[PDB]
Design a binder for this molecule. Structure first.
Ligand SMILES: [Mg+2]
Ligand SMILES: [Mg+2]
Ligand SMILES: [Mg+2]
Ligand SMILES: [Mg+2]
Ligand SMILES: [Mg+2]
Ligand SMILES: [Zn+2]
Ligand SMILES: [Zn+2]
Lengths: 222, 45, 38, 162, 97, 131, 176, 68
RNA sequence: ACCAUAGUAGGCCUAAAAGCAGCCAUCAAUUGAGAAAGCGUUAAAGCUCAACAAAUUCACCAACAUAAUCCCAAAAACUAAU
């Protein structure tokens, strides 16, 4: 004998037309003819843009930083389009098209001579940026089950997250930070310049607070 | 209250005390009351 | 056998056993599911 | 303690269960409000592999272990008991709890190698042929990480990998 | 229930289960009776007869089987558990006959 | 331990409680049986053969049965309800045609029961049947 | 040796499919079953399909038991339609009253599955209404004055709907 | 077979009894909307049957990712 | 571990679509069981899950080979250490 439990009933969920993921382009319709410098600050540091949900209730959260290109976009599009139900699910891109060009020199020739030819296009993704946001009238478990295969094959580490899971790990980070037992922390050392640590540390580390080093983000850092 | 203890056939010897007290209440009566009792029982059953 | 990095059951009759310090998928009905962690 | 007796008397098999008197718990624990048997007797972070008198309490006569539903222990301390019983068994303690097979004691082998604090099994460890330098060293584990929470009277941590 | 069904109990002739339901130590006997009286065990062979004797003051929970190796297995389950009774029953009655 | 959280009885639990109260109130014959897994055809034929003389049968979970029958006047039936069980239900008790069913199949035990606020055994049911 | 569930029409029992490969796989003679089925069924002149249980035996003989007919043919004969609804819920198949469902409830009260059940007539009328929920025929409590106008409208409406469906099917077959 | 129901053919195809012969409970039950979870009383066995059916629906939706 | 019986080949298309190439409904029996969550068939048949009833120690993710002359201080889990 066991006791029954109430099922979550979703009556306010509206499925928009064309619930599948929109097809993205290899190259944007206007090509960039000017070759610009490869900024790494679009990978470095925490994400500021599109860190929150808009319509859907599930997402792919990026724990690390990195570049996404047309192979990864086709991967996500094909995998979600064959693994979801169009009647019960809708999906949405939270990332733009590949717009930053990445160039290559014709391999085998010497260093110098100038810039190379434009090879492909990528999108920079920081840590904490949502990639694909999904909504529907069903639970998180099957959505997590088919989104972990998508999130595993991405370059940066990634997770299948919900609204409750994202707030759970965020307030977990806050309670760990306010339940620090040692009196010495990265903020107190770096902002006050303790032991002349700014000679070794970066000026970006005052904002990063030691949780970010390059493109790598460690959530256990506090 | 509580129910009976349900004795079994291995050592059945305990008759209910209600039966014995009804037998004694019958046996403490005269024959005019025997006839009245028999008439009142024949009328009911 | 198949030597693998992560182990999973390809059917419900497979079982986990720790032998010789390593983890084993052993299956009786389908012997093709025999897998060994590396 | 219940034992089963199987009797063969002329194509008739009789299987019976008999109760033998069992020892009881000691009357006065020092910490009566504790739930768990170790954690109410204040032996948490105290016992080791050497404590034979306590490891003999939660074991079978054939060297087996009793389940946690019977023993009543908390899960981490049950795992600590299991690791310490395994360590004592490979260390050569509890000699009377081996099973009896009289045909097998007579064919002697090479003498038993004296050992203690064995986290792993003797038969499943590969020899470290390659070893390593100081900047990458393959360290032989001695003792178990489940027992790092014991008290340190010297104050130094217990070196588990050497 | 499945262990007796897989093992081919067609070599068994007679089963009887004599118990007193008003006692406290007969639940293993009831579980063993429900194991030997399940559907697959019953349809393993139709020539085996099972008897469920119910008493009150018999004061002995017991099971007794006869099978055609000349053998009669009688075991009084009062302190025995149902798994022990099933294991001993199978490991005797399939090894003999 | 922390202080005990008070578990709330739900609508299903209360519905089964008043169902047990009703079947123990209005009926004259309540019989206990050791429930045996049968063929499903044999089960439904058994239901029809009990419909032939108006006796019904239910299964009630012991999780909601045992405390109610421990507070009730039928506390002596608790050793018959430790294991798997079945409840036989009659208005107007007549037990020749029920024991005729229970002797036609040899492996459905009759453990006990209560007829007219008196608790009887299987041999007591047999004597009450011949009476 | 096994069980076969076969829905066979009343006056047509033939030594061919689906009775051929199903019953001939068991090793049972088809002509003997056809003769006995025709003999048992020929007293019913209604022309109604029957679900039948064939218990094929290990000695290659057979036993036959006849049950009550199908809810689909019952409600199709009650509503006067030849086929069921293509899209259940988007459209209605037919219109009947409660008297058809109640009569079908008394007919199916002697079925092999439900006569062995002890359930009342409310259970079987709920079963037939629940079958109608997927079969597409919607019942009405009291339509007896209104069902004349309802049939007079709905026959013309469903004639237009069937003509449009046939035209769409012909256009789809031409474009495919 | 094919049969068309008319003014005479809908009443002569069967035995059309008066409404007073018929009970109350065929008129009692609903026709077109199935009962939902919020409508039914919580102390009704049909409510718990509907909740159990929703639980099997939830379990079937959860078990769509089976690897076996 | 334990157990699986009802309308019912739910309605269309199709040579066949019997829970299960596809589309639409997703009702209704028995305390108990989804017009069916996985295997299987040409179509079936059949084997499993959920549901009763029997009980209940805990159960969310995590583990991943290698090079060439000969491996590379020896070794140590507790006598008190800001
Ligand atoms: Mg990756
Ligand atoms: Mg139901
Ligand atoms: Mg199950
Ligand atoms: Mg290799
Ligand atoms: Mg050296
Ligand atoms: Zn396998
Ligand atoms: Zn403890």
């Amino acid at each position: 004998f066991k006791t029954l439990l109430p099922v979550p009933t979703f009556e306010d969920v509206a499925i928009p037309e064309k619930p599948k993921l929109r097809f993205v382009e290899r190259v944007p319709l206007v090509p960039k003819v000017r070759r610009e410098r490869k900024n790494l600050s679009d990978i470095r540091g925490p994400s500021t843009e599109a860190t929150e949900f808009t319509e859907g209730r599930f997402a792919i959260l990026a724990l690390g930083g990195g570049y996404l290109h047309w192979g990864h976009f086709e991967m996500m599009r094909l995998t979600i389009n064959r693994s979801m139900d169009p009647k019960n699910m809708f999906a949405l891109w939270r990332v733009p098209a590949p717009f930053k060009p990445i160039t290559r020199k014709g391999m085998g020739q010497r260093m110098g001579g100038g810039k190379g030819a434009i090879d492909h296009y990528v999108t920079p993704v920081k840590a904490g940026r949502l990639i694909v946001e999904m909504g529907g009238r069903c639970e998180f478990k099957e959505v997590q089950g088919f989104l972990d295969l998508v999130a595993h094959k991405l370059p940066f580490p990634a997770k299948a997250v919900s609204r409750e899971t994202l707030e759970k790990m965020r307030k977990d980070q806050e309670e760990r930070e306010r339940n620090n037992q040692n009196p010495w922390t990265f903020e107190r050392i770096a902002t006050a310049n303790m032991l002349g640590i700014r000679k070794v540390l970066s000026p970006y580390d005052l904002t990063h607070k030691g949780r970010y080093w390059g493109k790598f983000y460690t959530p256990e850092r506090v | 209250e509580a129910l009976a203890g349900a004795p079994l056939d291995n050592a059945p010897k305990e008759y209910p005390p209600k039966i014995q007290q009804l037998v004694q209440d019958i046996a403490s009566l005269t024959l005019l009351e025997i006839s009245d009792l028999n008439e009142l029982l024949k009328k009911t059953l | 056998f198949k030597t693998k990095g992560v182990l999973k059951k390809r059917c419900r009759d497979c079982y986990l056993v720790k032998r010789r310090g390593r983890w084993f998928i052993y299956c009786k009905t389908n012997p093709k599911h025999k897998q060994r962690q590396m | 303690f219940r034992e089963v007796v199987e009797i063969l008397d002329g194509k008739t098999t009789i299987i019976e269960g008999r109760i033998t008197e069992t020892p009881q718990e000691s009357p006065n624990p020092p910490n009566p409000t504790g739930q768990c048997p170790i954690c109410r007797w204040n032996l948490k972070h105290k016992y080791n592999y050497e404590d034979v008198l306590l490891l003999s309490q939660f074991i079978r006569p054939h060297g087996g272990m009793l389940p946690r539903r019977i023993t009543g222990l908390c899960q981490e301390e049950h795992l600590k008991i299991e690791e310490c019983v395994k360590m004592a068994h490979r260390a050569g303690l509890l000699p009377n709890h081996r099973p009896k097979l009289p045909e097998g004691f007579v064919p002697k082998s090479k003498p038993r190698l004296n050992r203690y604090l064995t986290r792993w099994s003797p038969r499943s460890v590969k020899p470290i042929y390659n070893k390593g330098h100081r900047w990458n060293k393959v360290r032989m584990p001695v003792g178990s990480p489940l027992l790092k929470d014991n008290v340190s009277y010297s104050g130094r941590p217990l070196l588990l990998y050497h | 229930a499945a262990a007796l069904a897989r093992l081919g109990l067609r070599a068994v002739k007679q089963v009887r289960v004599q118990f007193c339901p008003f006692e406290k130590n007969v639940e293993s006997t009831r579980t063993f009776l429900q194991a030997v009286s399940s559907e697959k065990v019953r349809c393993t062979n139709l020539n085996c007869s099972v008897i469920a004797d119910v008493r009150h003051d018999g004061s002995e929970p017991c099971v007794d089987v006869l099978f055609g190796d000349g053998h009669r297995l009688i075991m009084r389950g009062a302190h025995l558990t149902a798994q022990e009774m099933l294991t001993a029953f199978a490991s005797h009655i399939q090894a003999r006959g | 331990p922390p202080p005990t959280p008070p578990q709330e009885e739900t609508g299903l639990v209360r519905l089964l409680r008043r169902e047990i109260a009703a079947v123990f109130r209005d009926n004259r014959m309540i019989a206990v049986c050791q429930h045996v897994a049968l063929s499903a055809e044999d089960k439904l034929l058994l239901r029809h053969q009990l419909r032939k003389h108006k006796i019904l049968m239910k299964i009630f979970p012991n999780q909601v049965l045992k405390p109610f029958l421990e507070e009730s006047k039928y506390q002596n039936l608790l050793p018959l309800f430790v294991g798997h069980n079945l409840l036989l239900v009659s208005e107007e008790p007549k037990v020749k045609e029920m024991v005729r069913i229970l002797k036609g199949i040899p492996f459905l035990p009759l453990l006990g029961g209560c007829i007219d606020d008196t608790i009887l055994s299987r041999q007591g049911f047999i004597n009450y049947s011949k009476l | 040796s096994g069980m076969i569930r076969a829905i066979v029409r009343a006056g047509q029992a033939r030594p061919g499919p689906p009775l051929g490969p199903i019953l001939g796989q068991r090793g049972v003679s088809i002509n003997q079953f056809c003769k006995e089925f025709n003999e048992k069924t020929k007293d019913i002149k209604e022309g109604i399909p029957l679900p039948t249980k064939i218990f094929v035996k290990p000695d290659r003989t057979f036993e036959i038991k006849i049950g009550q007919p199908t809810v689909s043919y019952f409600l199709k004969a009650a509503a006067g339609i030849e086929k069921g609804a293509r899209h259940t819920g988007k459209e209605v198949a037919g219109l009947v009253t409660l008297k058809h469902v109640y009569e079908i409830a008394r007919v199916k009260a002697q079925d092999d599955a439900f006569a062995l059940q002890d359930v009342p007539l409310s259970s079987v009328v709920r079963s037939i209404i629940g079958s109608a929920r997927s079969l597409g025929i919607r019942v009405v409590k009291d339509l007896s004055s209104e069902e004349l106008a309802a049939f007079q409208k709905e026959r013309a409406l469903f004639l237009a709907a069937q003509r449009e469906a046939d035209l769409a099917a012909q256009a789809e077959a031409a474009k495919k | 077979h094919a049969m068309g129901v008319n003014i005479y053919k809908e009443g002569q195809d069967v035995v059309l009894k008066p409404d007073s012969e018929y009970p109350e409970w065929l008129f009692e039950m609903n026709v077109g909307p199935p009962k939902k979870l919020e409508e039914l009383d919580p102390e009704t066995r049909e409510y718990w049957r509907l909740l159990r059916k929703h639980n099997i629906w939830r379990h079937n939706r959860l078990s769509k990712n089976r690897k076996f």
